Amino acid sequence: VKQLSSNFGAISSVLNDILSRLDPPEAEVQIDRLITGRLQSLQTYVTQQLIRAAEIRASANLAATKMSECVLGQSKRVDFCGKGYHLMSFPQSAPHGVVFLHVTYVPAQEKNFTTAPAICHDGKAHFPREGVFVSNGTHWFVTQRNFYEPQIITTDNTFVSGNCDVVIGIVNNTVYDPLQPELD
């Protein structure tokens, strides 16, 4: 709207001022200058609208992917659905857009333990099935990686592979084997 006051090299930017005081053959050249200038303005507007629409289109594709993978499922890709281990998401509509509420899980209070890769019982090497071996200082337990829940090392809890001569930091401890008491 503001660019309508440009002369573009004509006597005035107002058509009615040119049409009075000038006859058609001399008014035509001035009108032609104004026409060229105003077509250029419209062209610039349309080009910048196209570039902006492309950016909004990329944003909307991202929003559709988030709706599919965070709201309609649980996502394992890191930082796609918030900070932390993603639990669930809820959408809310906003004017011209969307807001996502990401509920995630955050590990809170950490404690230090000494750890070991394997346990050497009887010339055998025992490895955790799905946990880690830790020590409170005097005793040895197996736990899960993301929450502390200590447990006694049993044979239904580890698995054997090879002897104790190859693993770098193996330690000596006993494995319960929870069948011997029952057989007796």
Added chain:
Amino acid sequence: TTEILPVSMTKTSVDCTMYICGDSTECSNLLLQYGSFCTQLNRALTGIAVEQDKNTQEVFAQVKQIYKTPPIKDFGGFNFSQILPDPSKPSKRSFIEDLLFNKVTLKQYGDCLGDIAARDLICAQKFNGLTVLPPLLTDEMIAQYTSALLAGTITSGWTFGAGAALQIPFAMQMAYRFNGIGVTQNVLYENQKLIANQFNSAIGKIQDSLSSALGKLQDVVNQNAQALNTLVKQLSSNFGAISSVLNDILSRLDPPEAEVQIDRLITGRLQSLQTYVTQQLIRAAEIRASANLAATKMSECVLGQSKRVDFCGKGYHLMSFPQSAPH
């Protein structure tokens, strides 16, 4: 294996009157009728310029804890000395970053006075209103960010990307990652020396292949330079006027007859500036898509272990390490 990504481009600004009129007062009085267009062009350019800093922030500044690598380098036989910062060079850059920075080749008024002008291309640009603005983060700050990311990954695995960094021995982390591709831990623990030797040899191959590659990063520099030099060359067009030189027209012609020629030149030079700004916008959109991809890779390959095929290399992904490169 290595993957190269562009993240940012050169920031530019234009003095519209300096380009169109030079030091001619009459041309400036004539150009006062087109001020809205120069303001509009500069708005578009400033949008591009702030977007570049936003791109760099999104790729490199994810974590705000600047971790330090431990003095004791006991990582189970893995040797990361080639990607950790050298504490003796002025720039605290790793060996590989120093090699990479030497493979891409990127001013006072008294410095170029007389002959030096119009010979040196930068001064020819600067005498016509075309300036290049410096980025917000220096190379040293980006190197600091990358070293923090590296120290986090090799001392705490993937825990520092979800909260506080929890330390774990490096071999036990490697065993965890073997669990994540479907291989039991004992394979790693039994074959640990072989695995460490293979990793060290592969890093050596990367190093020896770089000192001998970065076309994706050189073409961005070349494109920006070529556009600015094309703008400088387009000042010799008549656009249907008697000459392309304002001073030649202003002598030999009186104001009423000089105005029509000056008007032709003004229209032509505004069109040139407009074309430059449009192509800069399209290029900035492409660089923005590339930087979004780089941020996603940093999140999913460096701060975690990815199970999507071919996103983080060829084969079953184990881990990734970032290095900064110019742009």
Added chain:
Amino acid sequence: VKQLSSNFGAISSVLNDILSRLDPPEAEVQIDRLITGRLQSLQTYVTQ
């Protein structure tokens, strides 16, 4: 192809019609109008 019939403020859109009936000094201004218009058309095509 269709945009070749625009005058762009010239007497005609056909070069051969202008070149007959007009001498070089007066034909130059009309030809200049046509040249500016057709360069603008090519530019718009390349941008889109």
Added chain:
Amino acid sequence: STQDLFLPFFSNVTWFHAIHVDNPVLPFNDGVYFASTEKSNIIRGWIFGTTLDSKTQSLLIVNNATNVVIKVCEFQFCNDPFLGVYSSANNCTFEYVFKNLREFVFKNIDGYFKIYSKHTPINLVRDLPQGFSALEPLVDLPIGINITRFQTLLALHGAAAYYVGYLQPRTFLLKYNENGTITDAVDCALDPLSETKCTLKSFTVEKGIYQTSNFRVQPTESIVRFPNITNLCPFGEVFNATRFASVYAWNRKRISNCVADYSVLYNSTSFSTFKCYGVSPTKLNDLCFTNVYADSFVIRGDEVRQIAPGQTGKIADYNYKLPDDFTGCVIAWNSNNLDSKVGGNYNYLYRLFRKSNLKPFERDISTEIYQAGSTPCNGVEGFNCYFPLQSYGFQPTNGVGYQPYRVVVLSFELLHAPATVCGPKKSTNLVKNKCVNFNFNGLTGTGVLTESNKKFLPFQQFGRDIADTTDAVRDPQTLEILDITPCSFGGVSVITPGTNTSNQVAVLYQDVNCWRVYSTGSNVFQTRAGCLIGAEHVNNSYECDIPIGAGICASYQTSQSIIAYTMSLGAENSVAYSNNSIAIPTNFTISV
């Protein structure tokens, strides 16, 4: 926004008193702002003029006890005029018959003397007051004189004080309220802050960093360098020759090494036709001319319109042809007294017949019996076999169309090669290493001149770069090569905490190593982004508030001031790594 002659904001005005317990003659440069603080009607009027001594014309604007009198005459003004002015007033062309702030603005443009004014109630004792009030048009007098000086007319027996300021061409941003009155303005060239206000087209600026404009230097001197020429051009054997040539065998004469001062023809020669191609007649006095030639002939009066580019007719087809691209002038005058004889003057001739049209600047003198049809002539001249040339019968009693006219065509080149004609203009000294307006052989520009190592071949005068602008020149006096450099270079930025918060700003000069600065002040600090002026540097490291660049940021802190620092990247914490040590979380957090 409007560009016009205004009084700049915060200027330095002169102050004059009439205190018992001043009416000097002042300059009138480009228009005057006149303010008057009164309570007793002491200031009564003005006189405007050049010499004010009856040799020239002067303007009197006086308020006598009863009337307002405006006169334009030749006055013998008194040395000390007052009320309780002049002696003579001979040739008059135009005639017409502290509690107060009487503001006037006086302008003199294109023969019109323009007056704006406004009156305001005040209550003060001294010093011109604060505030804003726009003056309205009062009168526009068609006097048509050359005002250069002026003098105030006071009255005698009282307390009065008057202030004088001078107008300059400026761009202002004026504000109109909903009633149509100007209530505020911004001077767009006072400050960089004002420049960002002008660009954003608002009176309010938000916090940030803005690019303003490249650093500009205005020229101090003007220089002219023309060759050493002493002789005057031969206007007397070109325009005052006793015999002219016939149009078919037209004459061409070389002209060189002479000053082209044509004002000597003002009394000499009245021209019915004088038209110039490729140059404006008002620039002839400031130019130097290359390859000058003069063509002379005599034609009939009706045929003069044919001596022009792109013409038809027998003169323009068989006798004399001009190029389509012609630079030069055509001059024609009636010569009935010289070239008409009572019996009939048959000395002058033309070509009536030619197989084909002539090329530009081609002469044909061939007298070959023209064959009209078939049946060759064998040069015998009969039916369809005509003598090619024909003669003009010039008699004193011809109609104006049939009378003789003398025609001179001047052909030359401009601003490309060394020249030797060079119209009347006095040369100055050559000054170097300063931005100066310059004129070299008619080519005008602005810039800084330096000694050059370039060696020109003898046939060249100017040197041009890739953008086609002239960057080297041979001096026409000392024959030494000089380089030309622009004097506007370097980027500028302004840092503001917001106009709402403060008016204090900082300025960054991107191409200065700390002087091409607007003001030095204090707190000059050097960064890789440039020289920063107006900010205090601290040794802390905060988060980035306003980005300056190259790692440097700025803020407005606590007394309040702008501080510049190096941005911090975050907290530093080292991980407690060992080869047999793990850390397990014991509780969790649920975060949205």
